[PDB]
Amino acid sequence: GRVQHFTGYIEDGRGIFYSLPDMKQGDIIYASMQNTGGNLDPLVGIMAEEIDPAVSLGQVLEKALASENDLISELTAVADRIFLGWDDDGGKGYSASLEFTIPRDGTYHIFAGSTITNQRLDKFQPTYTTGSFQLILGLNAPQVISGEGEPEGEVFASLAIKPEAHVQELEIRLDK
Amino acid sequence: DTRYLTQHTRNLQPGDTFHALVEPIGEAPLPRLRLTDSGGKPLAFGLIDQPGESVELNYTCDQDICELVVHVDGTDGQKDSGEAVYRLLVGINAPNLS
């Protein structure tokens, strides 16, 4: 069992990607993603090659859908397609416990970000969430999904390089 | 005044079902029904039934404990509807229409 720690910040549901080069078929990947601050509802996923989930997930945001289980259906279908394995937004075992058996040799990527959920009871208003987190990564280490993580062996992963536009102006007024 | 509604339900035990229904008793427009957790995160949709007048809704508890909150969305309706009545049918284990 080999175990690593990571911390980071999700700025309105844009996630962070971590590279896992030369993984071996039959390896078991264990991921735990816990909220450390803010209202972030964590979303963990594992992929083979990198394609950007913000585009696809952004389209789910745009749907002011028929009603709630329409969102379940649409998020379920998108997550299943984008990731080889995924696990969700908050709950009892903190937020993201995800066991994944590696199907073949090669480079893999785990995505750590926001789910899309409702926060409020005054109106049904589903959005991405924001905040800091701790990610526990385990290679053949079952204790990671038990809520106990200690850094254990050799490094196998680190931070994966894409552009995001935001611009504004306003009027500044210096005087007496 | 009150254009949206919630009801905090009882704590559902592991592997226990839930049934819900809305019916316009005062010939009012059709509402959206939903089930959500104690926080915001939602669990279901109250679908519009075969007849076309009832809002049928279903869910079963998979987490360790389920504390639930039924929503009755009143945003798509008659503008300033002084009277709008609804009959909210809610129950745990028997699908019937102590």
Inter-chain contacts counted by CB atoms under 8 A, chains A and B:
56
How many whole angstroms separate alpha carbon A70 and alpha carbon A107?
Answer: 34
Residue A70 CA, chain-centre distance (Å), reads 21
- The residues with which A9 forms a beta bridge, in sequence order, are A132
In terms of residues, how long is chain A? 176
Q: How many helices (H) and strands (E) does chain A have?
A: 2, 11
How many whole angstroms separate alpha carbon A118 and alpha carbon A133?
Answer: 19
Contact A38, A129 (CB under 8 A): yes
Rg (CA), chain B: 14
The residues near A162 (Cβ < 8 Å, ≥ 6 apart) are A52
How many whole angstroms separate alpha carbon B21 and alpha carbon A110?
Answer: 41
What is the residue type of A60? Answer: V
Is the minimum CB–CB distance between B55 and chain A shorter than 8 Å? no
Cβ pair B63:A91 closer than 8 A: yes
CB-CB: which of A66, A69, A117 is closest to B40? A117
Q: Which two tokens stand for residue A34?
A: 């816990």
How many whole angstroms separate alpha carbon A80 and alpha carbon B27?
Answer: 42
Measured in degrees and rounded to the nearest 5, phi and psi for residue A166 equal -145, 125
Task: Using alpha carbons, list the distances in angstroms from residue B75 to A60, B25, B29, B33, B81.
Answer: 22, 18, 10, 11, 11
Contact A11, A128 (CB under 8 A): no
Q: Which two tokens stand for residue A119?
A: 């926060």
How many whole angstroms separate alpha carbon B54 and alpha carbon B33?
Answer: 10
Q: To which H or E segment does residue A55 belong?
A: helix A53-62
How many whole angstroms separate alpha carbon B43 and alpha carbon B58?
Answer: 10
Task: Find the Cα–Cα–Cα–Cα dihedral B76, B77, B80, B85, rounded to 10°.
Answer: -120
In the PDB record, what is the listed experimental method? X-ray
Cβ pair B44:A72 closer than 8 A: yes
- The residues with which A136 forms a beta bridge, in sequence order, are A5, A32
Q: How many angstroms away from the CA of A123 is the closest CA of chain B?
A: 7
Q: In what order do the strands lie in the sheet with A158-159?
A: A85-87, A42-47, A106-114, A16-23, A158-159
How many whole angstroms separate alpha carbon A92 and alpha carbon B37?
Answer: 13
Measured in degrees and rounded to the nearest 5, phi and psi for residue A53 equal -70, -20
Contact A30, A98 (CB under 8 A): yes
Contact A162, A49 (CB under 8 A): no
Q: What is the resolution of this structure in A?
A: 3.8
Contact B46, B56 (CB under 8 A): yes
